[PDB]
Structure 1
Amino acid sequence: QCTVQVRLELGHRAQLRKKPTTEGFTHDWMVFVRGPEQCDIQHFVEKVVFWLHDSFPKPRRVCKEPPYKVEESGYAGFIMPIEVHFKNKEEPRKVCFTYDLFLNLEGNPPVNHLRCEKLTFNNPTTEFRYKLLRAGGVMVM
């Protein structure tokens, strides 16, 4: 009997692009998944898949190691499925987040947003427990 808790941070930055008036993309943005400082989520994260809007070239963006991030230009915000896959041999194998990638419209200052997620693993295998603790995970009885 034990629970191991680990922390993910999802976030994004967005700002106006300065290029020619005839390039349609108004914004640069960057979306990420990371650990808190001094945690190494690579120990328990196999890969992160960012599912961009269908209009993007190769919209299924895979990061198999850090940094887990996509840097793009665009003309609109959208809802981004973000899948974090685990180095786990049993369930759960992954978690899906629905990430609100919104841009700064109407001359508002840049977006710099963080969304903090706690993952709770009940009774993980010996092996996966060690990966979670190795990543800076916390046990509970």
Structure 2
Amino acid sequence: QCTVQVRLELGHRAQLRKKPTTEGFTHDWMVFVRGPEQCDIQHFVEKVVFWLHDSFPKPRRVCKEPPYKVEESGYAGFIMPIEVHFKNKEEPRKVCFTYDLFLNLEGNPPVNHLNHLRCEKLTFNNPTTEFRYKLLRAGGVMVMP
């Protein structure tokens, strides 16, 4: 009875533009999904889908290859659903996350640049030898339940 644990980092960067765009976009931002500490999650990740707000053209943004990121400009923050799909025949084939993109914070001295990061731990129960190999090539660690 083997249990495999893998870690993913979800984060974002946002910066006030020197000059707003013609449509009034005030900020440049990036949202990303990556492995911690030089672990390559491409061994076990097939693709990552970033679901942007309806206001953006073609909101369903797909990264099938690293880097897994979206870089955009805008005027407001929003909740971004994010789907990480696995290189697995069996279930689970995907995991769903939600990421809160925030562009600003209220502060005595204004800050032009912002960055945030979260650590998400994923647990797979009795994977196949092929998928286990994939998770462990990406820095996964196995415990016994």
Q: 1:110 to 1:47 in 2, by over 3 A?
A: farther
User: Against the structure 1 CA distance between its residues 110 and 69, is the aligned structure 2 distance closer, same or farther, given a 3 Å change threshold?
Assistant: farther
Which region of structure 1 is more displaced relative to structure 2, 75-84 or 12-21?
12-21
2:136 counterpart SS class:
helix
Partner of 2:142: 139
- Work out the number of aligned pairs and report it: 141
Whole-angstrom distance in 2 between the partners of 1:20 and 1:27: 8
Change (3 A) 1:109 1:125: farther
Per-residue CA deviations over 1:46-103 (Å, capped at 9, x if unaligned) read 0000000011011111010110000000110000000000001111100010100111
Check 1:13–1:56 CA distance in 2 against 1; reply closer, same or farther (3 A cut). Answer: same
8 Å CA contact 2:20, 2:26 repeated in 1? no
Unaligned segments of structure 2, at least 5 residues: none
1:26 Cα shift? 0.6
What is the rounded CA distance, in whole Å, between the counterparts of 2:61 and 2:123 in structure 1?
26
Distance 2:141 2:36 in 1: 13
Contact kept in structure 2, 1:32 and 1:68, CA below 8 Å? yes
Q: Counterparts of 2:92 and 2:49 in 1: how far apart (Å)?
A: 16
Q: Counterparts of 2:110 and 2:73 in 1: how far apart (Å)?
A: 14
How far residue 19 of structure 1 moved from its aligned partner, in angstroms, is 2.3
**8 Å CA contact 2:6, 2:135 repeated in 1:** yes
The answer as to whether partners of 1:13 and 1:110 remain within 8 angstroms in 2 is: no
User: CA, structure 1 residues 41+127, in 2 after alignment: closer, same or farther (shift >3 Å)?
Assistant: same
Post-superposition offset of 1:43: 0.2
Q: Secondary structure at the match of 2:117?
A: strand
Distance 1:73 1:34, change over 3 A: same
Contact 2:45 2:85 survives alignment (8 Å): yes
| Equivalent-residue separation in structure 1 for 2:117 and 2:137 (angstroms) | 24
TM-score normalised over the length of structure 1: 0.93
How far, CA to CA, are the matches of 2:117 and 2:94 in structure 1? 21
Asked if the contact 1:15–1:110 (Cα under 8 Å) also holds between the matched residues in 2, the reply is: no
> TM-score w.r.t. structure 2 length?
0.91
Structure 1 gaps of 5+ residues are: none
